[PDB]
Amino acid sequence: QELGTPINERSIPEMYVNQGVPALKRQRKVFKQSQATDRESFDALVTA
Amino acid sequence: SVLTKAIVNADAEARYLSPGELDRIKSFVASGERRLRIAQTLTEARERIVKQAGDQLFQKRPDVVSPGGNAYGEKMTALCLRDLDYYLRLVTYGIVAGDVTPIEEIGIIGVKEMYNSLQTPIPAVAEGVRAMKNVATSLLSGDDAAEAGFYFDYLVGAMQ
Amino acid sequence: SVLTKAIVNADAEARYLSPGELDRIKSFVASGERRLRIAQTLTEARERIVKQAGDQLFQKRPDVVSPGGNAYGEKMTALCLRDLDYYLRLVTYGIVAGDVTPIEEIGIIGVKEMYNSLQTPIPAVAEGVRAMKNVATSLLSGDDAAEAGFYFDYLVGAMQ
Amino acid sequence: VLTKAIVNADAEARYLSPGELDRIKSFVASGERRLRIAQTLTEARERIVKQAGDQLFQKRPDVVSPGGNAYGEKMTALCLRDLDYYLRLVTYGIVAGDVTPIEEIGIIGVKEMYNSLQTPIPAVAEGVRAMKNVATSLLSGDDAAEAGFYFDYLVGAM
Amino acid sequence: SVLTKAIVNADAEARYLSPGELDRIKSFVASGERRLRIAQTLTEARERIVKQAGDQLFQKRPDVVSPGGNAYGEKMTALCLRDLDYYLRLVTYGIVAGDVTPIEEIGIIGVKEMYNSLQTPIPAVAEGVRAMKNVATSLLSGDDAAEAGFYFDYLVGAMQ
Amino acid sequence: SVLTKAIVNADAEARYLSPGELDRIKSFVASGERRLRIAQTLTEARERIVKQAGDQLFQKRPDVVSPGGNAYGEKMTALCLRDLDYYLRLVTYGIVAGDVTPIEEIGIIGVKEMYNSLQTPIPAVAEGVRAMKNVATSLLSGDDAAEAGFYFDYLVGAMQ
Amino acid sequence: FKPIRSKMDIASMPLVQAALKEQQATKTALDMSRPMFLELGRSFKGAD
Amino acid sequence: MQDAITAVINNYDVQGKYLDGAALDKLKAYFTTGAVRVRAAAVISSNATTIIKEAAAKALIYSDLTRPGGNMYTTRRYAACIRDMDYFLRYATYAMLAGDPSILDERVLNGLKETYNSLGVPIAATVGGIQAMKEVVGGLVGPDAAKEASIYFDYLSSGLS
Amino acid sequence: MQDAITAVINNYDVQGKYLDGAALDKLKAYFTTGAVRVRAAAVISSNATTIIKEAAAKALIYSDLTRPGGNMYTTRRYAACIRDMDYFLRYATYAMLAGDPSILDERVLNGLKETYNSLGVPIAATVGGIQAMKEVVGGLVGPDAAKEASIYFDYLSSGLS
Amino acid sequence: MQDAITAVINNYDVQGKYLDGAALDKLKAYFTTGAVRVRAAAVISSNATTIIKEAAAKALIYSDLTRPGGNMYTTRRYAACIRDMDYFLRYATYAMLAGDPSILDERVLNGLKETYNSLGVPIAATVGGIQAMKEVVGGLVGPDAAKEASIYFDYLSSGLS
Amino acid sequence: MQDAITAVINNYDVQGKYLDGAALDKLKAYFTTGAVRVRAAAVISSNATTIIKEAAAKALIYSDLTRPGGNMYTTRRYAACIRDMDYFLRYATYAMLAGDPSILDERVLNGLKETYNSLGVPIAATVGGIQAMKEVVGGLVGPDAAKEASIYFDYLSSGLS
Amino acid sequence: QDAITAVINNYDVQGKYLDGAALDKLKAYFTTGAVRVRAAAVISSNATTIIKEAAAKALIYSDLTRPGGNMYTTRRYAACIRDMDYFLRYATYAMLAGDPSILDERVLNGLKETYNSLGVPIAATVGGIQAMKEVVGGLVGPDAAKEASIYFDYLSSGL
Ligand SMILES: *[C@H](C)[C@H]1/C(=C/c2[nH]c(/C=C3N=C(/C=C4\NC(=O)C(CC)=C4C)C(C)=C\3CCC(=O)O)c(CCC(=O)O)c2C)NC(=O)[C@@H]1C
Ligand SMILES: *[C@H](C)[C@H]1/C(=C/c2[nH]c(/C=C3N=C(/C=C4\NC(=O)C(CC)=C4C)C(C)=C\3CCC(=O)O)c(CCC(=O)O)c2C)NC(=O)[C@@H]1C
Ligand SMILES: *[C@H](C)[C@H]1/C(=C/c2[nH]c(/C=C3N=C(/C=C4\NC(=O)C(CC)=C4C)C(C)=C\3CCC(=O)O)c(CCC(=O)O)c2C)NC(=O)[C@@H]1C
Ligand SMILES: *[C@H](C)[C@H]1/C(=C/c2[nH]c(/C=C3N=C(/C=C4\NC(=O)C(CC)=C4C)C(C)=C\3CCC(=O)O)c(CCC(=O)O)c2C)NC(=O)[C@@H]1C
Ligand SMILES: *[C@H](C)[C@H]1/C(=C/c2[nH]c(/C=C3N=C(/C=C4\NC(=O)C(CC)=C4C)C(C)=C\3CCC(=O)O)c(CCC(=O)O)c2C)NC(=O)[C@@H]1C
Ligand SMILES: *[C@H](C)[C@H]1/C(=C/c2[nH]c(/C=C3N=C(/C=C4\NC(=O)C(CC)=C4C)C(C)=C\3CCC(=O)O)c(CCC(=O)O)c2C)NC(=O)[C@@H]1C
């Protein structure tokens, strides 16, 4: 148990979230023509 | 229908269907029989729903059935009612499908462009759909009405 | 209130307010300022009126605060006093309204049924109200007391 | 309360502990509030006794019956006088913060005294209970709780 | 504990708890939450209290940690510190209990005999406890310190 | 606030807060609840205080509401009353803070310059504040009034 | 000197947060020094 | 229904509060207005027939409605419309005395829109007639009374529309 | 005997552990319950005679036991039985204040079964009486206190049976 | 600087609103917490020297920093580092009394990163020291105070990093 | 309405089948249960007023509902609520005799939800009251009868919720 | 698309409102649905093994895997097993859908031409698909197998 607890408290948990490369990088979606084979997919492609 | 939606999400992810996704499909197939009954009810009442909604619309908008207005004249008034009938048929299709997609492909894409060429006012069309919803809701039982309402609301949102 | 009563009678007759009815309204509006003061007096003395009336009631009816009796025990005695307080509040409302209607809706309809389920004796409740009247009368001036008495009497008449 | 603390210390043969001293301090502060509670009951004393008496007689018809001890004017007065005595003792208790004052005057030898008189002890207890209910109504809730303890003790003693 | 003591006196007398006894119980339960905090503070600072007290003791008594002395050597010095820790734990127990009884049974009865067999000097042990008190007092707030002091003093009194 | 002031003095001295200073903070936090009530009272009576003070001011100074005077005209009179309202709000803030600093930053620094550009007479403004004080004092209990008076007096001093 | 925004609200701080729960939760209970008959008659929800 | 006095009482009753000075002030306000209202009501009752006549003249008559194919064409329909006008007037008078709009909601306003839509009665024209009645009433009652009278007329109009 | 506070302490002492938050929570739980318990105890003490009377009425009296040839027949035996009932009540009250069942084991429960068997006192009837006292006590103490009171009464009953 | 009381006032002032009950409740909350805060502050002030000593021992000393060519090497640099530690402690104490983190931003946090970078002081080591002080402080202040104390220490740490 | 005997008959009638042994067995099952049911019904009828009183005491009274601003505040509302409680009891008794839940659906359950929603009566509280009545009823009827009684009470509760 | 949508589309071209006969077809699908879901879960769990077994039956121990064969070299081998997975996943999708259209829209369209340019042997691929079908049939069980088989056969016929 001790070896998986923080040595220091982490008293404001929000600070320690949102450290690093921002989440935006992971959130975003990729669009391809191979996915386009539908009328809605195509509309998403174009908007993108 | 719903199942198509689930498959499409899986294909995008390039994965087999998730258990949770599969469960939702199971729920949908069970719900379908109830949905069919709701659709059946509206189909039977279709003629009256259209008629009542039309009258309400014309009262709400005198202009549409006026010499300037698009709806004016017997031929034109019939066409306006035919349009209302079309939208009702689409709504029934939606309820059985469990998704707006069937409705959307036939009626909501390019609708703006079509009506603009016709010169029909889009807001009036929306009012007609709203009117149909109110009539339909009354005939439907409350829970059934809520289900039907969602599809009706989508149409109103689309033509807006 | 006086006004509500007059309107209701007119509506039943399907007529505009009669001159006589209008005159009564005029009298009421003049009386109102006096009435407000009478109500204010009782509100200030409320706590003592309830306390004194309770004691009188318990002297008048030893049984109610006895092991058999409903009022017996601290919890129960508090509830009995709370009831007396409720009726006093209703009486004040009545005086300002100039009619028993406000009192009647909150307190006198279904009162028998409520108390019978509780098993509280209705006559004892009436005695408590009578007791409150006597205390209230003493604090009020004679003319003021007469006005207050009418409302108190109504309550006693309603529940017996 | 102070007497009690001193007595415990003397038995232990020690000076009063700081904690014990603190309790004494709290008591002296509380005393003024206690005096007010006692004052309230004193003012309402006459009515409390009267109301309690009536309740008791309703609860026990027998006591005020030709056979019963309480029966007759002289006897009924004495019964009410006894109730008054107990109320006075209760007030003394509240100011003292202890039952000891009450206990010495009223609860030791009470059984023996009443047995000679032939007064029924349970009826006396009921009268004290009755007085408690009347007193509670006049007192505010927190005040009533304090007063209740002393009243309960009397009922327990009798 | 306070409560145990009261119950025991009642049982000896073969009576229900006296009002006065009940009042003391009430006071104790109110005090308890404050007591818990005081105990918690000392527990957290335990390691430092022991360390500081040890150093003070060794400065005060060079001899104990000298080749002749009992405390001398790593093993022995550890044991001396362990003893100090034990006494601190007992003190915390005392504070929550509100009585010295918990302390007394574990640590003060037969203490003389135990240490005499060990040949540990009792006065030195007492000094260590005094030292611990001073450290503990500094960390505690004044009123809290006074409460803690009583328990510390008792230990010092017990051991001479 | 009182606490801010204490901290600032400590920081200038580059020292931790003195025990005496800490004690004053303790006293202030105890006083705060009483202070909140005083502020609440004035807030409720705010509308009337402003109105009454305005009337008094205009009686005291006919000139300000004269065709020559700055206050004259509906628009101008409203603005003068708005200013009085502003100062009252500031006073309430001061009472809860326990210090004039909140009042001072918002209202008393650069006030001369602002009013000189406006051409409003500063002494008249001071009179208005004095008038508000008198109204406020009457509604407040004596000890409460004294507390409120200090803040009112400061404002009057500032606008001089 | 550019003036600085507030990162944390007063209510987020632990001691305040706790005191708010204590007043908010068990805001309505039983009032001492209030005669019981008045307390039983008192309303909790009030408006609404 | 409800009246101003009862409205105050009801608000206090849900709170469980005894009547307080602030509440008393609202009641006092009503009592001063009361005398004016009574005078206004008597004026309206006496001139009711004329008020309706004038309002009809202003909006309803000499119009397509009265002409053949119009809603108010035929004696039966004409009579119906003036009957409705009378209803609105009587209820507005009741509301003015009461000092509360509730009676309008409970009796007049409830289901009227739906009824009219089924009948094919034109709502906007009806609203126009109500507004016309208001103007005529305003004159007769006089200015102080007119403000009070106007709010109830406007309430009816808003409900219908 | 032992009490809740001491029980926690003792458990920690055998472990040698300093008091920890989990332990603190148990102590804190007791402290909250404490005030209720004190009130309950005072109620029981005042009504003790009646509690016994009521319980006896419910189970013991008007029965074969009281009739000749029954265990509680003769004044001496009757008095003994009510004395035993009082003991159980007093000890249960002590236990409730303490928050620990140990005192019952140390004083009441030890050797009771054997004593009763030699005496020929009927255990099931005694248990019945204890249960009856519990019910009466529950009423007087009120619901929150009743739950706490009940466990000690049940403990006595289980021991005897 | 700003404190909780002033923060509420300032928020209302920008709105232009008079103080309201909701605002009053926040103020009331602060007033109760105040007493605890004062006790904590006194503890910290008395133990300040030790807190710094312990924290340095935990993180700074016996390290490359103290060894020649390290940032804390030489008496002058060593003294500077412990002076900085004291600053952080004093300001955190001020913040805790205030109930607001703003003072930390206005005095300590502003320009610190830039100062340290020019000096070549290691930020991560400094942060380590602050965290160490927090742990020591938490013990001394006790649990109720600890949570409050921790947030200000964490705020400093986040600012520096 | 329908009862168990008629339900069997109706199922056979739609099939057009003459009654068969399997059908007879179902009827026979009902006939055995019948005697118990009759006894239970008589118990409930005699104790109906008390059952309602006890159930109200358990859930409805001494609550926010009875306090001002609560649904059951005012004598009129209080009386209405106890009238509804009586209805539920009477119908459940009818259903128990019948051996069929249909009557509950036909009379009590149909439109109740909608009525309650318009009225603003709280369904969950009503359900609570029904459950309370069930518990009281269970005691009086005794165990064998209780099982049968419980299902109808539960049916009502499920319908409302 | 899906069985449900297929019915809808047939009605839409007619312009007819939904009828009982249409509803019956939809109802038929709904009953089959539960079976299909169970089959799909079986296939997903055993997908890796299904591919392994099918490869063992046809692809490996063959000229293809030997040098000079299409599936020779790690890169080509990996490509072939990737294709096999595709076929399996899409067939599973089709089985749930109850419609062969998805196979035409994604898998079948342009595959022949792609394979001819690549020089991948179609007949061998078809053989692999048939092998997968046989393995799948076992795991799913008989009722499910009939439904599963049609989609596999559809892929094979297209290729
Ligand atoms: C390791 C001792 C420490 C550590 C590393 C760490 N790095 C990142 C993120 C990034 N690393 C870089 C750095 C560089 N880009 C360059 O071109 C160069 C010079 C050639 C370097 C050194 C970059 C750009 C990033 C961000 C972009 C990316 O990650 O692709 C992280 C965060 C990674 C994340 O996913 O959040 C970490 C943790 N952190 C430690 O704690 C060590 C002290
Ligand atoms: C006192 C003169 C008599 C007395 C009072 C008494 N009342 C109850 C219980 C209730 N009293 C009410 C009454 C009202 N509710 C209302 O809305 C109004 C009008 C505004 C009244 C008057 C109610 C609803 C209750 C139920 C409990 C609750 O409030 O939640 C009791 C106790 C009930 C019981 O024992 O079951 C008593 C004692 N009883 C007497 O005998 C006195 C003569
Ligand atoms: C002529 C013989 C007498 C006369 C007539 C008169 N009429 C009006 C006004 C109106 N008359 C009508 C009548 C009808 N509307 C209908 O639908 C029918 C049945 C088909 C009838 C009979 C109406 C509606 C009006 C109002 C105006 C309109 O048409 O919108 C007037 C004018 C009065 C006025 O001030 O409006 C007159 C003079 N009056 C006489 O004195 C003759 C004896
Ligand atoms: C006059 C300004 C407008 C007008 C009136 C009009 N109304 C009707 C018919 C009806 N009007 C009502 C109205 C009510 N019934 C109610 O119960 C209430 C509230 C309690 C109202 C206000 C109803 C129900 C009817 C139908 C039956 C009846 O008249 O008793 C008509 C005639 C319609 C018909 O075909 O009979 C008319 C003309 N219409 C206008 O065009 C004017 C603007
Ligand atoms: C009659 C002169 C007085 C009187 C009598 C009375 N007794 C009871 C109840 C009981 N009496 C006894 C007494 C005895 N049991 C014994 O074993 C002996 C010696 C052999 C005696 C004398 C008992 C055991 C009971 C309890 C019930 C039972 O019999 O099982 C009552 C009823 C008590 C009650 O309140 O229920 C009464 C009335 N009461 C008087 O006041 C008379 C003066
Ligand atoms: C010896 C005569 C005395 C003594 C020394 C002592 N020092 C330490 C620890 C440290 N001392 C230093 C000192 C310096 N660092 C510098 O940069 C300079 C100038 C170049 C000096 C002289 C430092 C930095 C430390 C900390 C450890 C480290 O280097 O990281 C100790 C032990 C520390 C402790 O208290 O635990 C001691 C014992 N102690 C005596 O009593 C002698 C009189």
Tell which phi-psi region holds residue B38, choosing left (phi > 0), alpha (psi between -120 and 50) or beta.
alpha
- Positive or negative CA dihedral for E111, E114, E116, E118? negative
Which residue minimizes the CA distance to atom 9 of ligand 4?
H80
Tokens of J27: 């103020």
From the list H78, H64, H79, H54, the residue with the least C-alpha distance to H135 is H54
The Cα C122–Cα C115 span in angstroms is: 7
In the numeric block, the tokens 């504040």 are attached to F129
Which residue segments constitute the domains of chain H, with CATH numbers given?
1-161 (1.10.490.20)
From the list B135, B124, B134, the residue with the least C-alpha distance to B71 is B124
From the list H136, B15, D5, J152, the residue with the least C-alpha distance to E23 is D5
* Alpha carbons within 13 A on the beta-carbon side of E77: 14
Q: Which residues of J140-160 are buried (b: 16+ CB within 10 A; e: fewer)?
A: bbbebbbbbbbbbbbbbbbbb
Tokens of F96: 């809860």
Contacts of F73 (CB under 8 A, 6+ apart): none
The Cα D39–Cα D91 span in angstroms is: 8
For D24, which DSSP code?
H
Residue C14, classed as helix, strand or coil, is coil
From the list I39, I58, I5, I56, the residue with the least C-alpha distance to I140 is I39
The Cα L139–Cα L54 span in angstroms is: 13
DSSP letters, L51-75, are HHHHIIIIISSSTTTSTTSTT-SHH
Tokens of I13: 């002492």
- Helix locations, chain D, DSSP H: 2-12, 18-43, 45-59, 73-96, 100-102, 110-117, 121-138, 141-157
- φ, ψ at F77 (rounded to 5°): -65, -40
Distances (CA, A) of I149 to E22, I13, I43, I135, I143: 17, 29, 12, 10, 10
Tell which phi-psi region holds residue G2, choosing left (phi > 0), alpha (psi between -120 and 50) or beta.
beta
Is residue J13 within 8 A of residue F13, CB to CB? The reply is no
Element (H, E) at H19: none
* Alpha carbons within 13 A on the beta-carbon side of F95: 29
What's the resolution in A? Answer: 2.8
The Cα J18–Cα I158 span in angstroms is: 66
Is residue H96 within 8 A of residue H37, CB to CB? The reply is yes
The Cα D105–Cα D107 span in angstroms is: 7
CB atoms within 10 A of CB E145: 16
Question: Residue J130's Cα: distance from chain center in Å?
Answer: 8
CB atoms within 10 A of CB B39: 23
Tokens of H154: 């406007």
Is residue C110 within 8 A of residue K76, CB to CB? The reply is yes
The Cα B2–Cα L5 span in angstroms is: 10
The Cα J74–Cα J97 span in angstroms is: 36
SS3 of chain A: helix, strand, coil, percent, to 5? 50, 0, 50
Task: Give I153 Cα–ligand 5 centroid separation in angstroms.
Answer: 28
Which residue minimizes the CA distance to atom 17 of ligand 2?
K74
Tokens of E131: 């030292």
The set of chains that have 3 or more CB pairs under 8 A with C is D, G, H, K
Is residue K66 a known part of a binding site?
Answer: yes
- φ, ψ at B53 (rounded to 5°): -65, -40
Residue A29, classed as helix, strand or coil, is coil
* Alpha carbons within 13 A on the beta-carbon side of A23: 4
* Alpha carbons within 13 A on the beta-carbon side of L124: 20
In chain I, the residue whose alpha carbon lies closest to the alpha carbon of E12 is I107
Contacts of J71 (CB under 8 A, 6+ apart): J65, J77, J81, J120, J121, J122, J125
Is residue D50 within 8 A of residue D106, CB to CB? The reply is no
The Cα I88–Cα E68 span in angstroms is: 61
Contacts of A17 (CB under 8 A, 6+ apart): none
Is residue B39 within 8 A of residue B129, CB to CB? The reply is no
- Positive or negative CA dihedral for I134, I139, I143, I149? negative
Distances (CA, A) of G3 to C154, F10, J12, J106: 70, 23, 18, 9
Instruction: Kindly determine whether residue E43 and residue I44, on different chains, have CB atoms separated by under 8 Å.
Output: no
Distances (CA, A) of C37 to C22, C34, C142, H25: 24, 5, 14, 12
Best probe residue, ligand 2, of C79, C92, C119, C155 (max atoms within 8 Å of C-beta): C79
- Which amino acid, residue E15? R
Contacts of D51 (CB under 8 A, 6+ apart): C55, C58, C59, D130, D134
Distances (CA, A) of B49 to B35, B132, C103, L67, L133: 19, 6, 49, 73, 51
* Pocket of ligand 5 contains residue I58 by CB under 6 Å: no
- Positive or negative CA dihedral for D19, D24, D28, D31? positive
For E17, which DSSP code?
P
Chain D, window 92-151: residues with a beta carbon less than 8 angstroms from a chain E beta carbon:
98-99, 149-150
Is residue L155 within 8 A of residue L54, CB to CB? The reply is no
Is residue D124 within 8 A of residue D82, CB to CB? The reply is yes
Task: Give I55 Cα–ligand 5 centroid separation in angstroms.
Answer: 16
In the numeric block, the tokens 């049976």 are attached to I161
Element (H, E) at C17: none
The Cα K21–Cα K4 span in angstroms is: 16
Is residue B28 within 8 A of residue B2, CB to CB? The reply is yes
The Cα L143–Cα J5 span in angstroms is: 75
Residue B107, classed as helix, strand or coil, is helix
For H107, which DSSP code?
I
Shortest alpha-carbon distance between residue H23 and chain G (Å): 15
DSSP letters, F141-154, are -HHHHHHHHHHHHH
The Cα B114–Cα F150 span in angstroms is: 76
The Cα H106–Cα H3 span in angstroms is: 13
Out of G10, G13, G20, the one facing J151 most closely (by C-beta) is: G13
Distances (CA, A) of I34 to D144, D152, E28, F22, K153: 20, 20, 9, 35, 40
Residue A20 CA: which ligand 1 atom is closest?
Answer: 36
Distances (CA, A) of L107 to A30, B7, B26, E79, G40: 21, 14, 26, 79, 75
Residues composing chain J: 161
Method for this entry? cryo-EM
The Cα E124–Cα K143 span in angstroms is: 75
CB atoms within 10 A of CB D80: 17
Tell which phi-psi region holds residue H120, choosing left (phi > 0), alpha (psi between -120 and 50) or beta.
left
Task: Give I115 Cα–ligand 5 centroid separation in angstroms.
Answer: 28
Question: Is G18 buried (19+), middle (13-18) or exposed (0-12) by CB count in 10 A?
Answer: middle
Chain H residues touching residue C92 (CB < 8 angstroms) = 18-19
Is residue C68 within 8 A of residue D61, CB to CB? The reply is no
Question: Is G20 buried (19+), middle (13-18) or exposed (0-12) by CB count in 10 A?
Answer: middle
Which residue minimizes the CA distance to atom 40 of ligand 1?
A20
From the list C39, C56, C151, C52, the residue with the least C-alpha distance to C103 is C151
Is residue A9 within 8 A of residue J134, CB to CB? The reply is yes
The set of chains that have 3 or more CB pairs under 8 A with J is A, E, F, G
Chain D, window 126-145: residues with a beta carbon less than 8 angstroms from a chain G beta carbon:
140-143
The Cα I1–Cα I101 span in angstroms is: 9
Ligand number nearest to the C-alpha of A20 = 1
* Pocket of ligand 6 contains residue J66 by CB under 6 Å: yes
- Which amino acid, residue K73? Y
The Cα D147–Cα J114 span in angstroms is: 70
